[PDB]
Amino acid sequence: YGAGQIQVLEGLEAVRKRPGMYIGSTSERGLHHLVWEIVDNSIDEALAGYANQIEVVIEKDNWIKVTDNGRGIPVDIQEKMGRPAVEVILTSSVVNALSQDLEVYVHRNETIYHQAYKKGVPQFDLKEVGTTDKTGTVIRFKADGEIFTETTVYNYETLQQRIRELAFLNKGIQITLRDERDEENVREDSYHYE
């Protein structure tokens, strides 16, 4: 309960109290904005010269998974908070605050690190769960139905349109959209402009 952790909790309270001020609306438009908030991080990492693939998956029950092959959100214990950098970054994330559940897997230092959250609150300390020969960041989230009180169901065409545009605007980045909500009938569109 240091000043750092107190500020974190106040920040989550503030986002959840006035979500529309952060993401425009809590309508279907705001729901889809959650995806762009996450994907923008991957785009910046690609433009910085450290990533070139981004994958957005609509999973069963309208979870969203975003994966990039960037450097991975750092995990070193931070000066300000005395907590892993990734935890500080995600506990101040609007998407995390407005998600009933969110998971991160960081591939970095030939290690896979995992943390989970509910409404932005970490459920356990960042944990090493395995090894890897890749780098990057995986984020999985389920939008909070307490916040998004019109719908929590994503529109494939809405995601598709903007993903295609993002690939066209940010040449060289391979951006893939896949709908896995119905395991019997899976749709994928992959964009890569030169």
The one segment of 68-76, 112-120, 147-155, 177-185 that binds ligand 087 by CB under 6 A = 68-76
Please choose which of Mg ion, ligand 087, none residue 70 contacts, taking the beta carbon within 5 to 8 angstroms, the exact cut-off set by kind: ligand 087
Residue 91 found at the interface with ligand 087 (CB under 6 A): no
Instruction: Determine if 144 is a binding residue for ligand 087 (CB under 6 A).
Output: no
**114 near ligand 087 (CB under 6 A):** no
66 near ligand 087, judged by CB under 6 A = yes
CB 54 within 8 A of CB 173: yes
Choice between 93 and 115, CB closer to Mg ion: 93
For ligand 087, the binding residues (CB under 6 A) are 38, 41-42, 45, 66, 68, 70-74, 89, 137, 139
For Mg ion, the binding residues (CB under 5 A) are 44, 52, 172
